[PDB]
Every structure is written in C-alpha cells, then in structure tokens.
C-alpha cells in the first residue's frame, strides 16, 4: 500500500499548531457544506437524561 | 432519427398568453378520432363529440375507439402528438382528480364536474374548448359506472324524497384524499336518451332470465354429472316464491344476447396504463403503457 502512492507533490498553505513537539493540521469544512442540503457531520447533539 | 409524431395546427391566432397556457400541459392524454397524420384542432378532445340530450355512456364507448396520444412537444403553429407504443413507459399528467399511487391500473374516463369548480380554466378559442379525460384508477372506475347505472334506475321515481336520500349517498363517492360529487345524469326529472337505453339494456336482460331459464335447465339437469346445474333450478323454483309458437322462442332468445352486446360497453373496461414511480406533490407520474 505504501508503494501504491503517487510520487507527485504540490504545495498548499495551511494553519498548524505545534503541540507535544508535534505538528497538527487545522482545517475548516464550512466551504464543502455551505449551500448544500445535508447536515454537517461535525455539528451534532447529545441527549442528556 | 427523431421519433415519429403527429402534427397538428390550430386555426385561430393565439396570444402569447395562450401558447403559454398550453405549455403547462406538456404530457396529457389527447383522444384522436382516427390515426390521420394531419389533424385539425377541432378534432382534438371530446369537445367535437359534446352533446346535450346524449348521455355520458355515449362518451364511454366512442372514447374506447379514440386514439390516446400524448403531447410530446409544444411550439408555435404545429403541435406534436406522440402515440404510445405498447410496452414502453410514458409520463402522463395527473389531470385526474384522484391521487395516483404505485401500480394503479389507470383507465381513461370522460371528464365530469359538480357545478362550478375552483379552476375550470383551459385553452379556449372562440366557441371551441378543450376537454382532457380523467385518468382514474381502475377500482374507482368500476365504482363510477356502478353508481351511474343505479342512479338512473330511480329516475322513474324522483317523486319520493326518501329515494332522493339514497341518491344523495350515491351522488358523492368518497375515495381517500378526494371528495367527489358525481353529477346526476337526470336533468329536470326527464332521462337522457342514452340513460334510457342503458337502463333498458340491463332490465330487459334480467326479465328474460326469470322465465327463459325454466325450460333449458330441465333437459340439461339429468345429463350433468357435476350436479352443480341440478341445484341451480332450486333457486329458480324459489324465485317463484313471491306471489306459444316455437318461433317465438327464437326471437325471444335472440334479444337476450344482442342486448348484452349493447350492454358490454358498460361492463368490461380496458386498462390503458399501469403506474410506476410517482413525482412529488402528485403533479404527474410515469406509467408504462399497456393496451
């Protein structure tokens, strides 16, 4: 599976945080759900009893 | 490579509001008197057949000989008409008051009304008018004629208002998601001549059955081994419970069969469509064709 990956690469700008001396990506998904007719999976709810 | 389509041309000039009045009726059954290639708009619809004294039953029969045809496309001048081919699917407008659902055995019936409607509006040239027949589901289509025939049997006696209370019940069939009020075929107490014939078409048959059966059952009873005929005479002898030249028998039997051929128009009903998917809000639904 590791050898199946394409070797092509391109830059793209991103926001990142450095925690635990480890990089972590930040990324909104608002652009891919705005003006569409399905609920965003990240926005959910809890039923406390 | 385009599919064949009948052409049709209106004569009276149309305003742009009128040609747009017709584009709202893309899919729509349109009876055609004969499979002519050209056709005047006067031939379209049942409106050329419209009559006063002639009854609904006359529309019930001539419509069976009409060639149903969808309006595949609407433009200026010429109007296309796509005759269905058996076994292909065809989208059709739900002009019928009944809501459609999956798998209905739709069959055409002439349009009806109960006085003024919320929207009688249709395409209207001078004097000329269009009439698009209902596409009722089959089980209701039996219920229509079963009411229309019984209502004329009481037409001889409108004088008893207690009978009218039964006519008021038959007048308003109540299929689900519908509130019909079937018009009385009778007008000013007098019957239509088509109604007078349809009532004669049945009552004459039942009268001959009461007496003609008494003879032929006798000779045919002993020969039968199934015995089912032997008990048929029992109800006939109990049908008496209430209170001749050989040539006369031939003319008497001869009427009994020919009247049923006249009555057959009201009995068996061809199905013209069977539903598949239904569009939202039931504006229309596709239906595979079936002659």
């Amino acid at each position: 599976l590791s050898q199946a990956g394409a070797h092509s690469l391109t830059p793209l700008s991103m926001d990142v945080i450095r925690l635990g001396e480890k990089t972590v990506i930040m990324e909104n998904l608002r652009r891919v759900y705005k003006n569409t007719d399905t609920k965003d999976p990240l926005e959910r709810n809890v039923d406390l009893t | 490579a385009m599919e064949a389509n009948i052409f049709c041309t209106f004569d009276h000039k149309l305003s742009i509001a009128d040609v747009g009045k017709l584009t709202k009726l893309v899919a729509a059954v349109v009876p055609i008197p004969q499979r002519l290639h050209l056709i005047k708009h006067y031939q379209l619809g049942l409106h050329q057949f419209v009559d006063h004294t002639r009854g609904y039953v006359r529309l019930r029969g001539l419509l069976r000989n009409m060639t149903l045809t969808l309006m595949r496309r609407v433009e200026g001048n010429q109007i296309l008409l796509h005759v269905p081919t058996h076994g292909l699917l065809y989208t059709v407008l739900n002009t019928g008051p009944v809501t459609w659902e999956k798998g209905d055995a739709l069959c055409v019936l002439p349009p009806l009304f109960h006085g003024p409607l919320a929207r009688e509006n249709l395409l209207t040239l001078g004097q000329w008018e269009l009439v698009l027949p209902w596409i009722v589901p089959m089980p209701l289509a039996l219920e229509i004629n079963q009411r229309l025939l019984i209502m004329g049997l009481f037409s001889l006696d409108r004088s008893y208002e207690e009978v009218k209370a039964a006519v008021q019940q038959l007048q308003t069939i109540t299929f689900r998601d519908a509130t019909f009020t079937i018009p009385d075929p009778v007008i000013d107490q007098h019957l239509l001549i088509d109604m007078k014939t349809a009532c004669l078409s049945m009552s004459m048959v039942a009268n001959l059955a009461s007496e003609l059966t008494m003879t032929y059952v006798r000779k045919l009873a002993l020969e039968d081994s199934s015995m089912l005929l032997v008990k048929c005479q029992e109800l006939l002898m109990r049908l008496d419970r209430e209170r001749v030249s050989p040539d006369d028998e031939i003319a008497r039997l001869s009427a009994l069969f020919v009247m049923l051929r006249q009555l057959d128009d009201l009995i068996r009903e061809q199905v013209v469509f069977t539903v598949c998917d239904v569009s939202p809000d039931n504006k229309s639904a596709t239906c595979i064709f079936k002659g």
Binding site: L1, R31 | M2, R73
Partner: protein, 98 residues
C-alpha cells in the same frame, strides 16, 4: 420603460478531497477493478517480549498471537436528470439559422 440590468449567475466554489486537509487522515488509492472484489483483509503477526521470572514463580510462554483486520465498503451514488427536449436538441440540428 422598465430597466433590466446585467444578468448574473453564481459560480460554484470548486473543492477537492485530494487538496483538503482531511486527506492527511486519508491514504487514497485508485483501483479500477474494485467492484469485482468482495472484502479486503490485513493479517497481523505479533509475538510479545517476555521477562525472566524469579524463583518459585510460573514462567511465561514464548507467546505468539495473530489477528485479521478487514475493510468496510461505503458506496455512494448521485442522481441528475436531463430533459428529453435537451436530448432532441443536443445532436439534431435544423437549418443553420441564428
């Protein structure tokens, strides 16, 4: 007179899962024959290290353990209709009128 102005049409904001940062959690790989396959699997071979025991205690076995890890299909499909009038106007062409 009424005054019509310029016409407008919104353009969609193009997006790509390969460009999105959620792909850092992904490892996408094309495979044209994927419809033919049933279910994948990934066998894992494991042998745990052991420590020497003291006197009077049971000794650890040379333990070995293996597991299998399958996969989950998630098919998706999107309808879109095209009018039959668009079909008859798509390839058929009458006179070359404007």
């Amino acid at each position: 007179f009424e005054a019509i102005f310029g016409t407008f049409c919104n353009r969609l904001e193009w997006v790509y899962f390969l460009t999105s940062g959620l792909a850092a959690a992904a490892h996408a790989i094309k495979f044209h024959d994927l419809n033919k396959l049933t279910t994948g699997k990934m066998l894992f071979h494991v042998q745990v290290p052991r420590v020497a025991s003291g006197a009077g205690l049971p000794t650890s076995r040379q333990t070995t353990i293996m597991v299998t890890k399958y996969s989950e299909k998630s098919p998706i499909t999107i309808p879109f209709e095209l009018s039959a009038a668009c079909l008859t106007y798509l390839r058929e062409t009458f006179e070359g009128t404007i």
